[PDB]
């Protein structure tokens, strides 16, 4: 259930 991208 990931977040995708830069912090």
């Amino acid at each position, epitope marked *: 259930r990931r977040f995708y*991208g830069p912090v």
Partner: antibody
Amino acid sequence: KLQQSGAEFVKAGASVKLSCKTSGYTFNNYWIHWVKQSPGQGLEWIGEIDPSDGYSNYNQKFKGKATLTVDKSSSTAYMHLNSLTSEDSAVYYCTSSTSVGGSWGQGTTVTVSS
Amino acid sequence: SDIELTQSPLSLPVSLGDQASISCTSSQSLLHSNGDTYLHWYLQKPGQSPKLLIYTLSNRFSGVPDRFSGSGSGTDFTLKISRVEAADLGIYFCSQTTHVPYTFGGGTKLEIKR
């Protein structure tokens, strides 16, 4: 448009809730992350929370130390730190990001010292 | 067995108006199965929070000029800065979000040569 709570100066063994006020648009669209900057350990990812449904993942290291919550009503993001120690003395950033970037808060300093 | 990101060098003196390049080496492959490589570069200016330059390997954050360029693959990654300006000075961090927990490199300070 991010807005982080004021500096904290706390005893060891304390708990503090740091806060981060954003827009109603931000909260709906962006994910929220918390990040730690300390002179001992540099930059560290604490964890993330999807304000849409409150779903959250954590850096294994910060499980137990940090709890992440959101309150839709006020479009505010919260990070609870508990059992505080001198190693927790740091600048803590709240961020809003997407797959194509976003922005980081100005950051709350926490100082853990008696 | 978290992903460690090693930057080199620590401090990089450059003439203003010249090229700069900064290396970030990952202890593991950051290539995600969707084909993206989630290696990002930030710049931190003194007394301010980190700002995104380049994301998912080589994409420019909105408003970042193209004189900032990200490349690499596998485990070797480069940030090239093409026409170094004064407002480019400060500390550059790499960061991976391919694997949880997300990590940050130790930072490279871009300085003025003379």
